[PDB]
Structures are given as structure tokens and as C-alpha cells.
């Protein structure tokens, strides 16, 4: 079997000048290839360079040439992306690639990545997320069923899980993509939907968990007559 | 340097059907261009490097052909899992070009959505911003007009948006829609509202609340 | 020391001359030792006609005559038919059969 | 079980037509009124000799194919024959075998590496013939089928195919797909209350055979000169 | 407004086809998809048929995607829908509507008007 493990989530300033890793595993190392590549939340894919480390061959694409530098050793069993010039619009899911396709008659295709580093760059600082409930009303209510939710506003910096704490409980829970503030600050909604036998008296609480601290946040949701 | 294209840009079928798409590139060759099958967010699978050829382990649901220009990629069959979007890539030469993506998905009967609002509460006004939530649920078609009716007025231009996905379950789609005020703003006018219509719907939706109580 | 990289990349471009541009090249071995010959190359280079002498070879089965159709209701597996003592009566054409 | 073979096992030997001739044929052939092997498939490994002559009678294809080889075991050449449902395919593979060969779960072989490949149309209460003979660099195979113990009625053998194949054949067995079995190797001839199919397996010798053939090339009688 | 209504229909023998027809006139018929809807006695609305400009085929719903076809005529406002082999379950009231939003992916149900289809 063949492998990749990757860094954890990286952030910094723009115009700076960042590290990140891809540890390579399984097999023999001698006989791999590595490539990076960049995914955004829905603009088209980026590809930065490639290298060959058992023999130190390396190119790149005009776009990143200069500006970024590979370098992968087999003695610590990783690979190495050297990152300069960092600006906003590099806030993005970055990924390292094996190429294996250049000595079966498989030709220059990836076919294994490793599990992928979210970046951010921005201006902003880290700090845990603002959480505030809402009270529906029982005039409300639609088809003998009503939904509860929280929204989670002003945290930084990704990723982040936001969800219902445990158990069936969440049952018709529903939750939509993120946003990012002019300020530099993430933001999401969550959802959940209730019928009239169990609103209110259920005491719903919505959960946040902020990983890159690992800040547990929840509150509760509460209806109203 | 090269360029190329994908038509159409998007299909919809029902279970079972047959999908097929091309792809267009700009210098006339008869291999080194590769196919891809991608979701939002998640890695591509390799179907196709050169022209009609592929590996072990890629399934016979898929296959490709062309000459010149011009080459086709074909499904043989189509599911609820398969909601992705279908691309073309070419490495002829070393400056790699990607494909504009076609995206793929489930054709299904018309679905009323779930109307709802997202009246503010005082935790959130004390703040100094105020903001309210419109939400359509399970609709199939991509939107379905969410309007603010403040005072019974139209607003435009105030409101935040996010999307999900169609849903494998069902092939269903949800969408919602975001006020934002501030406090001095959202105290000045008293009554709120939402209004819906939709292709499956008997006649436009409104929902409100008001500030006196 | 020198950890050299044992393949290379040709790297070809037009700026290249021709003792160092793209050939793809085939190159193809052959036996012959005990052989219940599978693979063989010439083709039929065959000519048809009837009612005058001609000189006739049918998959081999050298020969001299006049051909003309026949009533003989061959099998479907019978391809020369011999009348007493073993005398070419009658051929079933390779082609039209 | 023994029973004895009438004038049944001829075959046309070489493609020549002849019409209103005695041709006398100094070939294999199974000697008239031999007594034959007689086994009830309602599949033991057999020797290969000079030649195989082989039939069945049943209504339900239980018999599906036959299976050669040397050693008859991945140690060496093989050949496979077997009938589907719509082709019959054949290899010569050396492929190693199942004790009891059972298709419905396909328990046909362990291993298969072959070398040689090929398929055609299909063979198809009634009665089946096949022989196999093996004098040159070549399986040969002929094959005949009728309405109908072996009948005392006289029929001849048409040639079916010619094989390239020069492997050496010295042990054979029959292929079975009877309605239930068992799904491994482990258990032979059970499963299922399966109906009156039989077949008989018959050894040809050097003989010299008298054939007659009609005004259409067909042969009807034959006498065996050694009898 | 976006006035619209139907023409044609009436009576017609079981198993038999025939066409309905619809038209408008004094405004642009290109910027709206033209769609079309159904009501059996005394039930509620149904969504039948729609087409659109790029001409990529058509959409219907499940009731009628097997066996009716629809068109449209950009340049004259006239358009169409097609009934095969009536039954007994289609005798309804039909109603023309556009999908009342310019150049929209959706649609919004404006009905025009409506006339009867019944098999004998
Ligand atoms: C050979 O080709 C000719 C011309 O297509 C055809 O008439 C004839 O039947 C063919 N014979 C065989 C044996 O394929
Ligand atoms: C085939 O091989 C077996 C096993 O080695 C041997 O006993 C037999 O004599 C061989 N037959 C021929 C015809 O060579
Ligand atoms: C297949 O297996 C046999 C052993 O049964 C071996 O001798 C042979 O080299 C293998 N490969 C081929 C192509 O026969
Ligand atoms: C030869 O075949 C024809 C046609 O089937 C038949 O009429 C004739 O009787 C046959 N010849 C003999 C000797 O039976």
C-alpha cells in the first residue's frame, strides 16, 4: 500500500513566506513521485510543481515559478513546498499528489493524495467564534412542525464543525456553507426542524468546536407563546 | 497556449439514463488528453489519460472517442451517487489545461419547499446588527425567488445567500436567504416578511412577524 | 558521491536536429522451430475463370483443366470431391464456396 | 458397467467427397461391437488413449463438456472444452482442475494461465456423439446429434473442428452441471435428484473400415474387416 | 402583463391525438420559458410540460413525459402541445402559463388561461 499524510491547517500574513509538508509512506520510498496541487471553495484547480525526490528533478508552472520551491527528502520520509509572495486569494484547500503514472505505461496522472491542508490569509487574528440563538414563535409554527437554529458568527481561523452535540437528537438537523466577512471573519448557520410534540420541551442545544484551539462553544435554542 | 472547452455545461437525467458530453480543445490531436470525474470539494477519479484508453480498475461504466479537435465522453448509466461534474484534461505538452466542467444530476417531479422565517432575537440586537433568515426547503428547481417584504415593502440589495447541493436521498435542493440591519435601521420600520412562489406551489407564500410582539 | 539518475528525459523540441527527434519505432521477432504454423503472410492474389483451359491451384491442389459449375450437392465440410480411383472431379471455390 | 457398442462410432476421415463408392479407410475407429465403459451421471479421470469415442443420451444438458491433459494438472499442458449457455469456449490452458468439476458457482478450475484461446457457436432424450483423435499436431473433433442404451442404428460422424494445438493428451475427464451441487471441490456426484442421463466412453484402434457412400456423399454402411 | 391563452381542444375519441394550441400577442415571447398545467375535476394543479429557446429537447413531468411532446414558436408567440393516445384519465382542464421571470432557471406559475379536453 501507498500513502500520504499531510500537515495540519496553516495560516499567515500575506506577503510572507510559509512551510508545508506531505510525509510519503508504504512501500518504497525510492520508487514515488509527489506533486501539489491547490483546490479553492469552487474556482477551478491550481497546480504548483512536481518533483521526483529519489533523483531531486523538480519543475514548475509559470504562474508559481520563483515564488515557490519544492524540496523532498527520503531520509524523513516527506516532501517539502517552499511558499512565498502569500496573498488573500491563496486561502484555499491544498493538497499533495503522488504521481506513480511514469514507469508501467501509466503516464504523468496522479492517482493518490494525501488528506488535504486548508490555508487562509488574512489580516485578522485567532479567536473563538460569537454564537447567539433565536426564539420562534408558536404563531409560527407550519404543519404541526416548527426548526430551531443557531448561527455562528466572527471566528478565525478555519476549520470549523459546527453541529448538535450527540445522540438521535439530531434528527432533521441541517446546516449550509460558509462565509467570510470583510473583517477577515468566518461565519455559518445550522438548522434544526421539530414538530409540535417535541418543540420547547426537547431544550435543543446547538454546538460549535473551533479545532485549531479546539474551543468548545453551545447554546441553547428556546421557543416562545 | 492551449485552451479548451466542455458543452454543454450541465445535464440532468433521471436514474437509469444515458449521459454523454465533449470536449473541446485548442490544437487538433489524437491522444495525451486525460477525463476526470470531480465533486465539490473532493478528489477527481482518473476514467480516461489518452484518447479512448484507461486502466486497471477504471469500470466499464465509462468511455470516451474523438479525433481532431473534438472528443466525446460517454456514461453508460446514471445514479443519485454519481451528482458530480464531468472534466476533460490535455498533456500533449507540459502547460496542463483543464476543462470548464459539465456538471451532472438527477432529473426528478416538481417539489413544493418548506417555507420558513428567522425572526431576530435581543441577544443579537444588543450587539448593534440585526438580521433575519428566509429558508426554502427540499425544492428541486436551482432557485425560487426569497423576497423581503419589510413593512410590506421590497427590499433588494441587504441579504446574504448560501446554497447547498442536491441531495443523493432524494435529488431534492434547498436554498436561503440572509437580512442584515442594523439595530437603529431594523427598530425603524416594525413588520417583517418573507414571500415565496414556486413551480409546484398553488399560489405565493407570505410569512411575517412584527416588532410589537 | 554521484547518485546518478539512471534514466533520462529526451526532452525533445524543434531547436532539436533529427538524430535527436521523437522515432517511434517497432521492432518485431519471429520463430519458426516446431511449428503447427499459426501466423502466415501472403494473401489470396487470387483470379477466377471458366470454361477454357487454365493452370489452378485451390489452397494447394495443383492442377490443369477446364472448371465449370457443377450439380454435385456437396456437405457443408467437404471442400474436393474425387470420382474412382481418386481423380479430381470437382473443387469447392475458396471464396464463393 | 459394460454394454456392448453396435455399429455406432464412425466418422468421414478426410473431406474428400465421393459419391456411389466403397473406399476401403485404414484409420482409428472404434471396432464393432466393442463393449464400452457405461457410467450414469444420474466423472472419474480416464485414460487418453489412440483415441476417445464419446456419447449421451438425456434431456436436460447435464453433460456440458470434456477436459484433457497429460498429467491433467497445473504441472503441465491442458485442454478445456465447455458448452455455455449460448457459446462453447475452448482453451488449452494447463490450468489445474477441480476433483469433481460442477457448473451452474462455476467449479471448473483452480488456476487458469492459458495460452490458447477460442470460441464458436454452440453444440446445440437425445442423443449425443463425439469422438477425439489426436494423430497429428491437432485436436480434431467430431460430433453428431439425433433423436432417440445405444441404439443398434447406424450413423456417421461429421468433423466439427481441427485444433492447432499440439499438446500431449493422456488423461480426460468429463465436465457436469446437474441442477443442485456443491459449491467447492470437497463432495462429488450429489445435490440433486437429478433425471435418467447417461454417457459411454469407447476406445477407437487401428483398423481398416469399408465405407459406402450414397449418391450424395453421405456415408450409410460400414464393415469392419477385422470383425 | 403577460397575457396568454389556449385554443383548440374539445372532444375527441379514446385513443385518438390531437393537438392544443396556445398564443400570445404584444409583448416578447423569447425572454420566459413557456409552460403548461393540468387539473383533473375538481383536483389540484399539475405541472405537464415546458420548453425553452436553446431548442436541447424538453421537459415534462411524469404523468405525460412518455407519451406528450411540447414546442414553441419564438418568432410568431405561438405555441404547443401534442396528445397521444388519450384515456380516460386526462379528461382535465389545461392552463397555459409563462414562467414569469426573464431569462430565470425556475419558474413562476402564471397561468393565462385554460380550456377543456374530455375523450368520449
Ligand atoms: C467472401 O466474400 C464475398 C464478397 O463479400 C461473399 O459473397 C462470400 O460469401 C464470402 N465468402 C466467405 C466464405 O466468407
Ligand atoms: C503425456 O505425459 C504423461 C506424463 O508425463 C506421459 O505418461 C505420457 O506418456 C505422455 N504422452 C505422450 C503421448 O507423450
Ligand atoms: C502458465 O503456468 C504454467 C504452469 O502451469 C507455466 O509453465 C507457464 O510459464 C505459465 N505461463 C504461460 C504463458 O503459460
Ligand atoms: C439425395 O438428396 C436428395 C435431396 O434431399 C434426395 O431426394 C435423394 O433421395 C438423396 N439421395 C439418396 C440416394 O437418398
Known amino acids: 500500500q501507498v500513502q500520504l499524510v499531510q500537515s495540519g491547517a496553516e495560516v499567515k500574513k500575506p506577503g510572507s513566506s510559509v512551510k508545508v509538508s506531505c510525509k510519503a509512506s508504504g512501500g518504497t520510498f525510492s520508487s514515488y513521485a509527489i506533486s501539489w496541487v491547490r483546490q479553492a471553495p469552487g474556482q477551478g484547480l491550481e497546480w504548483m510543481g512536481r518533483i521526483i525526490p529519489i533523483f531531486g528533478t523538480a519543475n514548475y508552472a509559470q504562474k508559481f515559478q520563483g515564488r515557490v520551491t519544492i524540496t523532498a527528502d527520503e531520509s524523513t520520509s516527506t516532501a517539502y513546498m517552499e511558499l512565498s509572495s502569500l496573498r488573500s486569494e491563496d486561502t484555499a484547500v491544498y493538497y499533495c499528489?503522488?504521481?506513480?503514472?511514469?514507469?508501467?505505461?501509466?503516464?504523468?496522472?496522479?492517482?493518490?493524495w494525501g488528506q488535504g491542508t486548508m490555508v487562509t490569509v488574512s489580516s485578522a487574528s485567532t479567536k473563538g467564534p460569537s454564537v447567539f440563538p433565536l426564539a420562534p414563535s408558536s404563531k409560527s409554527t407550519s404543519g404541526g412542525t416548527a426548526a430551531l437554529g443557531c448561527l455562528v458568527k466572527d471566528y478565525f481561523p478555519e476549520p470549523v464543525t459546527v453541529s448538535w452535540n450527540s445522540g438521535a437528537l439530531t434528527s432533521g438537523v441541517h446546516t449550509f456553507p460558509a462565509v467570510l466577512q470583510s473583517s477577515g471573519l468566518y461565519s455559518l448557520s445550522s438548522v434544526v426542524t421539530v414538530p409540535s410534540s417535541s418543540l420547547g420541551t426537547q431544550t435543543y442545544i446547538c454546538n460549535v468546536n473551533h479545532k485549531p484551539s479546539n474551543t468548545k462553544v453551545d447554546k441553547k435554542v428556546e421557543p416562545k407563546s | 497556449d492551449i485552451q479548451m472547452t466542455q458543452s454543454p455545461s450541465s445535464l440532468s437525467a433521471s436514474v437509469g439514463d444515458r449521459v454523454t458530453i465533449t470536449c473541446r480543445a485548442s490544437q487538433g490531436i489524437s491522444s495525451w488528453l486525460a477525463w476526470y470525474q470531480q465533486k465539490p470539494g473532493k478528489a477527481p477519479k482518473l476514467l480516461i489519460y489518452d484518447a479512448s484508453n484507461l486502466e486497471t480498475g477504471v469500470p466499464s461504466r465509462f468511455s470516451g472517442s474523438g479525433s481532431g479537435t473534438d472528443f466525446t465522453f460517454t456514461i453508460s448509466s446514471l445514479q443519485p451517487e454519481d451528482i458530480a461534474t464531468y472534466y476533460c484534461?490535455?498533456?500533449?505538452?507540459?502547460?496542463?489545461?483543464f476543462g470548464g466542467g459539465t456538471k451532472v444530476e438527477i432529473k426528478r417531479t416538481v417539489a413544493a419547499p418548506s417555507v420558513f422565517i428567522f425572526p431576530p432575537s435581543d441577544e443579537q440586537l444588543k450587539s448593534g446588527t440585526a438580521s433575519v433568515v428566509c429558508l426554502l426547503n427540499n425544492f428541486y428547481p436551482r432557485e425560487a425567488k426569497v423576497q423581503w417584504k419589510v413593512d410590506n415593502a421590497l427590499q433588494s440589495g441587504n441579504s446574504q445567500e448560501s446554497v447547498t447541493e442536491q441531495d443523493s436521498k432524494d435529488s431534492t435542493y434547498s436554498l436561503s436567504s440572509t437580512l442584515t440591519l442594523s439595530k437603529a435601521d431594523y427598530e425603524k420600520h416594525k413588520v417583517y416578511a418573507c414571500e415565496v412562489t414556486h413551480q409546484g406551489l398553488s399560489s405565493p407564500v407570505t410569512k411575517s412577524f412584527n416588532r410589537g410582539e | 558521491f554521484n547518485c546518478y539518475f539512471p534514466l533520462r528525459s529526451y526532452s525533445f523540441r524543434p531547436t532539436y536536429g533529427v538524430g535527436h527527434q521523437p522515432y517511434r519505432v517497432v521492432v518485431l521477432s519471429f520463430e519458426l522451430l516446431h511449428a503447427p504454423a499459426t501466423v502466415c503472410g501472403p494473401k489470396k492474389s487470387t483470379n477466377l475463370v471458366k470454361n477454357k483451359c487454365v493452370n489452378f491451384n485451390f489452397n494447394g491442389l495443383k492442377g490443369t483443366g477446364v472448371l465449370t459449375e457443377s450439380n454435385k450437392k456437396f456437405l457443408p465440410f467437404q471442400q474436393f470431391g474425387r470420382d474412382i480411383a481418386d481423380t479430381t472431379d470437382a473443387v469447392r471455390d475458396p471464396q464463393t464456396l | 458397467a459394460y454394454t456392448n457398442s453396435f455399429t455406432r462410432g464412425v466418422y468421414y476421415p478426410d473431406k474428400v467427397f465421393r459419391s456411389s463408392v466403397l473406399h476401403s479407410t485404414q484409420d482409428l475407429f472404434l471396432p464393432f461391437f466393442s463393449n464400452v465403459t457405461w457410467f450414469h451421471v444420474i466423472n472419474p479421470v480416464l485414460p487418453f488413449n489412440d483415441g476417445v469415442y464419446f456419447a449421451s443420451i438425456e434431456k436436460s444438458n447435464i453433460i456440458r463438456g470434456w477436459i484433457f491433459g497429460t498429467t491433467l494438472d497445473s504441472k503441465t499442458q491442458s485442454l478445456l472444452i465447455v458448452n455455455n449457455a449460448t457459446n462453447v469456449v475452448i482453451k488449452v490452458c494447463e490450468f489445474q482442475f477441480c476433483n469433481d468439476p460442477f457448473l451452474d458457482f462455476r467449479v471448473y478450475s483452480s488456476a487458469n494461465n492459458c495460452t490458447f484461446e477460442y470460441v464458436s457457436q454452440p453444440f446445440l432424450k437425445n442423443l449425443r456423439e463425439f469422438v477425439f483423435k489426436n494423430i497429428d499436431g491437432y485436436f480434431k473433433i467430431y460430433s453428431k446429434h439425433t433423436p432417440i442404451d445405444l441404439p443398434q442404428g447406424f450413423s456417421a460422424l461429421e468433423p466439427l473442428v481441427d485444433l492447432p494445438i499440439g499438446i500431449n493428451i493422456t488423461r480426460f475427464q468429463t465436465l457436469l452441471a446437474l441442477h443442485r451441487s456443491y459449491l467447492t471441490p470437497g463432495d462429488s456426484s450429489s445435490g440433486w435428484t437429478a433425471g435418467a442421463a447417461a454417457y459411454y466412453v469407447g476406445y477407437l484402434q487401428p483398423r481398416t473400415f469399408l465405407l459406402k457412400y450414397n449418391e450424395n456423399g453421405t456415408i450409410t454402411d460400414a464393415v469392419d474387416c477385422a470383425l | 402583463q403577460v397575457q396568454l391563452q389556449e385554443s383548440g381542444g374539445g372532444l375527441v375519441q379514446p385513443g385518438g391525438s390531437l393537438r392544443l394550441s396556445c398564443a400570445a400577442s404584444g409583448r416578447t415571447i423569447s425572454r420566459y420559458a413557456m409552460s403548461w398545467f393540468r387539473q383533473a375535476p375538481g383536483k389540484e394543479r399539475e405541472f405537464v410540460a415546458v420548453a425553452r429557446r436553446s431548442g436541447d429537447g424538453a421537459f415534462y413531468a411524469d404523468s405525460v413525459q412518455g407519451r406528450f411532446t411540447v414546442s414553441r414558436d419564438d418568432a410568431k408567440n405561438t405555441v404547443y402541445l401534442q396528445m397521444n393516445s388519450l384515456k380516460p384519465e386526462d379528461t382535465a382542464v389545461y392552463y397555459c402559463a409563462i414562467d414569469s421571470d426573464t431569462f430565470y432557471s425556475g419558474s413562476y406559475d402564471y397561468w393565462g388561461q385554460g380550456t377543456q379536453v374530455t375523450v368520449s
Open positions: 484534461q490535455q498533456y500533449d505538452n507540459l502547460p496542463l489545461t
Open positions: 499528489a503522488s504521481l506513480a503514472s511514469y514507469s508501467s505505461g501509466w503516464e504523468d496522472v496522479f492517482d493518490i
